[PDB]
Amino acid sequence: SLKETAWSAIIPAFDHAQNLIKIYLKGNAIITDLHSEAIKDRHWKILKKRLNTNWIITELTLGSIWDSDLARNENIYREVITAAQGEIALEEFLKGVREFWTTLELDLVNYQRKCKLVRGWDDLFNKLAEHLNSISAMKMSPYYKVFEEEANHWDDRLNKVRSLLDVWIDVQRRWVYLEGIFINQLLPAESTRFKSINSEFIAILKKVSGAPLILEVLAIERIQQTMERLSDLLGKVQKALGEYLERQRSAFARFYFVGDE
Amino acid sequence: SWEVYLEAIEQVDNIKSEAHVMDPKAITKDQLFGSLDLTTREWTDGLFTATLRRIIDNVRGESTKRHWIIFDGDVDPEWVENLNSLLDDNKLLTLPNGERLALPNNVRVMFEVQDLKYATLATISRCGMVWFSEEILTTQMIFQNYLDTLSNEPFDPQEKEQQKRNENAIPAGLKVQKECAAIISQYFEPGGLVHKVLEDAGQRPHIM
Amino acid sequence: KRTPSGETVLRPTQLGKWLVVFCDEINLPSTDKYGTQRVITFIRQMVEKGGFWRTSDHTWIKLDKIQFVGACNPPTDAGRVQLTHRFLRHAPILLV
């Protein structure tokens, strides 16, 4: 009857049967291993071929498995049991990267009724560095093959996010400083070059406030270019203001006795 | 002391005294003076900076009374160097947000401390100082204050409540307190038992 | 719980019960560079002054039915800090 029990079903001359049972008992280790969340379709497929068997997974009883010599073939079962257990350690890793990033919304904070900025920087980087590394290190695993297509997607996706954030924290910093200043009548030339930045920055920033999903903003029309474009500009502006203070100062030495703010 | 001087000077010039006491280190330095948000650059006040400002902005008649902002606790240069230019001669707290709040004439900043082991000449110099030696308060003045509270103050919060409404319109508890005040009163008097007992205890060793 | 007076008090969520905060190695809390065990000046504050300051909105909180009990090893043992005198003043001691 036991032989007759299918898979979702089972749960972990005289001397002939005596020993036969003796073996099944020994083997049993396998049946439990061969029943864990680790064993997927692929594994059963693998088991059908490495043992040259002509059976369909869909319907499988202990008899199916006990048919092949559990004792004589534990070896090939074991290889697989191990492979499967190995693969889920990775699969489970991907579950973490998957779950964390797929839903993650940028931590925004209000900025005096103008917009809202991105907070949580270093928190993002540590994760980007943890996952990134492990994604790399998980590429020298006897199991990497399987998942190696996703690994390559996250590796790209996540680097793009690391690059996106870097040029960002800069734009924001540079902006939060220069913003409070823009005197406009004093340095028109830059005041105007800043108005424009402050414009597409606020603009951009609203869209972020729309769908704050980091992976979603990452998909904004060439934002990596745009943010890099804005950072560059704010840089040429920041330098601009420095030289003006260097003149204001060299025009009234006593100004050297006061700070830039 | 300041409690007695505070409630008494309010009854001489007929002006409301008001003590704002805090433990300068029961909270962190940033919670005490305030800080700056590291993204929006917004300045948020500390408990001290807030209470000062509350006064400066006479929104609730602060101007009609004398204030005493008290730090009841340990002193170190770290939590004080943010108070120096307000205690020197410029009466000006200058926060990082650069707002710099002014010290009204109607305000006084005190400290109640046990020791100065970590204060510097620089942190003491710009401060008036009164020293209260344990010897002030006699063991006797303590016994006496005790015997008077026991015979005038009921243990029961319900009785003081039932004694106050009555005044504004001796429970059995207090009557028993008063009677005992009387039975033990003698062991407290000079050269007495409690006294003789205490003196001995103190000359013995204790775990703490 | 904001009281009628207009004052807010901290109290046990449990109806009709005093929370007892038993602190097992009370003398272990490390001091800062200036000999101050903050948890201890904090606890003195609650016991002596009646409460503490909420540093989020700057409101004085008056405990209702909350008390503390402490236990520890004598200060002679390694790691034990001699409790400030301002504290021990409110702390009756029983040696066991």
Where residue A205 sits, what CATH number does that domain have?
Answer: 1.20.140.100
Positions of chain breaks in chain A, given as the residue before each break (C to N > 2.5 Å): 12, 182
Q: Is A94 in the same domain as A112?
A: no
Structure tokens at A137: 């290190």
**Nearest by Cα to A215 from A169, A152, A165:** A165
Question: Are the C-beta atoms of A121 and A108 separated by less than 8 Å?
Answer: no
Please name every residue paired with B109 in a beta bridge, in sequence order, or none if there are none: B69
Torsion angles phi and psi, residue A107, rounded to 5: -75, 95
Which residue among C36, C53, C74 places its CB closest to the CB of B22? Answer: C53
Structure tokens at C67: 């008390």
Q: Which residues of chain B neighbour A119 with C-beta distances below 8 Å?
A: 39
- Coil, strand or helix: which one is B36? strand
Chain C contact residues (CB < 8 Å to B)? 32-36, 38, 41-42, 44-45, 49, 52-53, 55, 58, 74-75, 82-86, 88, 93, 95
Q: Is A118 in the same domain as A229?
A: yes
Q: Which residue of A has its CA nearest to B39?
A: A119
State which H helix or E strand residue C54 sits in: strand C51-54
Q: How far apart are CA A53 and CA A165, in angstroms?
A: 53
Q: Which domain holds residue A196?
A: 104-250
Q: Is A8 in the same domain as A73?
A: yes
Q: Is A246 in the same domain as A134?
A: yes
The resolution, in Å, is 2.8
Q: Which chains does chain C touch, 3 or more C-beta pairs < 8 A?
A: B
- How close C83 gets to chain B, by Cα (Å)? 8
- Coil, strand or helix: which one is A22? helix
Q: Which residue of C has its CA nearest to B116?
A: C34
Q: Is A97 in the same domain as A141?
A: no
Torsion angles phi and psi, residue B115, rounded to 5: -140, 165
Q: Is A233 in the same domain as A216?
A: yes
- Whether residue B201 lies within 8 A of chain C, CB to CB, comes out as no
Q: Which residues of chain C neighbour B74 with C-beta distances below 8 Å?
A: 34-36, 41
| Expt. technique | X-ray
Share of chain C residues as helix, strand and coil, in percent rounded to the nearest 5: 15, 25, 60
Q: Which residues of chain B neighbour A115 with C-beta distances below 8 Å?
A: none
- Whether residue B74 lies within 8 A of chain C, CB to CB, comes out as yes
- How close B27 gets to chain A, by Cα (Å)? 25
Q: What angle do CA C86, B110, C58 make, to 5 degrees?
A: 80
Q: Is A109 in the same domain as A214?
A: yes
Contact C88 B21 (CB under 8 A): no
- Whether residue A109 lies within 8 A of chain B, CB to CB, comes out as yes
DSSP string, B133-197: -TTSS-HHHHHHHHHHHHTTS-S-HHHHHHHHHHHT---HHHHHHHHHHHHHHHHHSTT-HHHHH
> Rg of chain A over CA atoms, in angstroms?
32
Contact C74 B207 (CB under 8 A): yes
Q: Which residue of B has its CA nearest to A108?
A: B39
- How close C14 gets to chain B, by Cα (Å)? 21
Contact C53 B78 (CB under 8 A): no
Q: How far apart are CA A41 and CA C52, in angstroms?
A: 62
Q: Is A114 in the same domain as A243?
A: yes
Burial B10-46 (b: 16+ CB within 10 A, else e): eeeeeeebeebbbbbbbbeeebbbbbeeebbeeeebb
State which H helix or E strand residue B112 sits in: strand B107-112
Q: Is A200 in the same domain as A111?
A: yes
Question: Are the C-beta atoms of B15 and B7 separated by less than 8 Å?
Answer: no
Q: Which chains does chain B touch, 3 or more C-beta pairs < 8 A?
A: A, C
Q: Is A129 in the same domain as A96?
A: no
The span from the first CA to the last CA of chain B, in angstroms, equals 28
DSSP 8-state code for residue C53: E
Cβ contacts of residue B5 below 8 Å, gap of 6+? none
Q: Residues in chain C, how many?
A: 96
Structure tokens at C87: 């504290």
- Strand B16-22 and strand A115-119: pairing? unpaired
Q: Is A122 in the same domain as A154?
A: yes
Q: Is A125 in the same domain as A227?
A: yes
